[PDB]
């Protein structure tokens, strides 16, 4: 019974890839899975997966200018998911 890993930030790309540096005050039990996709609806969703206070990582942004939407995920106490939080801001 909670809310999300609550910050949003993508500062800069590497015009190919992108740094994502969001909130994580500790962990909980331990965890991030982070969505990976455009907002197009096509080009399937994919997965970065990370540890500690580290939702503060960075993608591999293969393709070019196109709008990419990208969520993150907590995991907790219950081996299930605390909340998700998403932004979409592309290249």
């Amino acid at each position: 019974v909670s809310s999300v890993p609550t910050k949003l930030e993508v500062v800069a790309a590497t015009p190919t890839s992108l740094l994502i540096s969001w909130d994580a005050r500790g962990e909980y039990v331990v965890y991030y899975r982070i969505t990976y996709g455009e907002t197009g609806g096509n080009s399937p969703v994919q997965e970065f997966t990370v540890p500690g206070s580290s939702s503060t990582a960075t993608i591999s942004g293969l393709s070019p200018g196109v709008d990419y939407t990208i969520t993150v995920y907590a995991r907790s106490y219950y081996w299930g998911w605390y909340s998700p939080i998403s932004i979409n801001y592309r290249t």
Binding site: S3, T6, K7, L8, E9, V11, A12, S83, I85, Y89
Partner: protein, 459 residues
């Protein structure tokens, strides 16, 4: 083609609460240094042929010029107090302290080189020579530049809530007056050489304050990682090489006032002897109180680059404004006491003996450039100050001289009593700062939209 300077007005919500108020004591400890000088201009007049400043103002060139490079870490170590390890911040602090001690040994070798004002082409006050115990204020007070650089690299790590330097570099001058005169002629001390000995005194006091660095790993958690200040990592290990291109672009851009040097002292050089060499009584009273001015943003350069690591993007560069226009209050509400007042009977014969019997064609420019400049670098001490913005904020000033060139021989070639008349495109070279600078500070507070790439979050 009307305002390519985007949204200039806006740097505002309810910011009245912007407190860079300890960022004044940063430059009141600096009047604490500013003010020894006179305690040995008028402390070493005991020797009359010791107008001695004849060195200690062409020493203080390869100070304030290198001094630049070093004060270029002002951001570095604020911007990584958005992070956490002032020991990684510190491993710079050290890498630099290696600089401010390494470039301090060029200060201290380019100084060795220095000593041949055995040279000539123009007039007195600036050529003659015969008895030179400057000879010695050279070496004796040039032999410091190392420890005197580390002893700045100190406050190049006071860029994060301490001004324990208003503490020392006050009771550092107080250490010096006493000392100063012992060497000019004194007690049990080496009590002979005085036309220098004011200065061997002076510099002893740089190595004194040099370690109120050491002696302030003391009030709280460290800034001491003085493990071997070593480098090697690539061809040349940066965090040092990285300091380079915040360095070059500053001293070489502190070579602004480094030519407002051979401009200000080359128009006493024609038949304008008398009250055009009393120009420098005003333009010394320029620097004397232009300092608590100017250097507020050369203190506010913290509050901004510090709050970039701490990712409050423009939630600091829109205090760039409410710091810009805050001393900008007094930038003009004391250009009033500059075009107005003069050297009265409150002026005696101090910093340069010339008070009674000369004109006020001297407060004519105590307004021209005075406020139209005031802030127009406490812009840049918040450009570089903020970002890396000195890369061609170096070429900020290739125009503050290459645009104030002909307004050099345009007091000469004149239409009126143009004593402030080569202060023409040298208050217009200097008011095109109104632009490129605070241009890149809305090219630039408009870059922390790009970098604030997620407008807010949830709950």
């Amino acid at each position: 083609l009307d305002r390519f300077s985007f949204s200039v007005f806006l740097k505002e919500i309810r910011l009245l609460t912007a407190l860079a108020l300890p960022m004044l004591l940063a430059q009141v400890a600096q009047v604490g240094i500013g003010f020894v000088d006179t305690v040995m201009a008028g402390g070493a007049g005991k020797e009359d042929l010791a107008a001695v400043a004849l060195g200690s103002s062409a020493f203080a060139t390869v100070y304030i010029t290198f001094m630049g490079i070093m004060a270029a870490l002002n951001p570095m170590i604020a911007q990584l107090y958005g992070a956490g390890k002032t020991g990684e911040a510190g491993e710079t602090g050290r890498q630099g302290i290696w600089f401010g001690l390494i470039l301090g040994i060029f200060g201290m070798i380019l100084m060795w080189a220095a000593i041949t004002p055995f040279r000539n082409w123009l007039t007195l006050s600036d050529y003659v020579e015969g008895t030179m115990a400057q000879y010695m204020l050279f070496t004796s007070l040039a032999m410091p530049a190392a420890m005197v650089h580390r002893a700045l690299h100190a406050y190049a790590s006071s860029l994060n809530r301490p001004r324990l330097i208003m503490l020392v570099s006050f009771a550092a001058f107080v250490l010096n007056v006493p000392l100063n005169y012992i060497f000019v002629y004194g007690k049990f001390g080496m009590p002979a050489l005085g036309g220098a000995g004011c200065g061997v005194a002076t510099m002893a006091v740089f190595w004194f304050s040099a370690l109120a660095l050491w002696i302030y790993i003391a009030k709280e958690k460290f800034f001491r990682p003085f493990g071997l200040t070593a480098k090697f990592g690539k061809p040349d290990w940066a965090v040092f090489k990285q300091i380079w291109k915040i360095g070059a672009p500053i001293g070489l851009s502190y070579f602004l006032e480094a030519s407002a040097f051979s401009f200000i002292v080359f128009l006493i050089a024609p038949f304008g002897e008398d009250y055009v060499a009393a120009q420098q009584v005003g333009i010394s009273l320029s620097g004397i109180l232009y300092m608590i001015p100017q250097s507020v943003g050369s203190a506010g350069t913290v509050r901004i680059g510090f709050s970039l690591g701490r990712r409050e993007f423009s939630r600091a560069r829109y205090i760039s404004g409410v710091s810009l226009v805050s001393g900008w209050v007094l930038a003009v509400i004391t250009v009033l006491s500059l075009v107005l007042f003069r050297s009265p009977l409150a002026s005696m014969y101090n910093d340069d003996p010339a008070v009674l019997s000369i004109a006020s064609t001297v407060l004519l420019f105590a307004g021209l450039f005075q406020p139209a400049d005031f802030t127009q670098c406490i812009a840049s001490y918040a450009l570089r100050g903020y970002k890396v913005t000195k890369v061609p904020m170096f070429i900020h000033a290739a125009a503050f001289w290459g645009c104030g060139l002909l307004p050099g021989y345009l007091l000469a070639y004149r239409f009126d009593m143009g004593i402030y008349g080569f202060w023409t495109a040298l208050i217009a070279s200097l008011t095109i700062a109104a632009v490129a600078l605070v241009w890149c500070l809305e090219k630039y507070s408009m870059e922390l939209v790009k970098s604030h790439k997620a407008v807010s979050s949830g709950l």
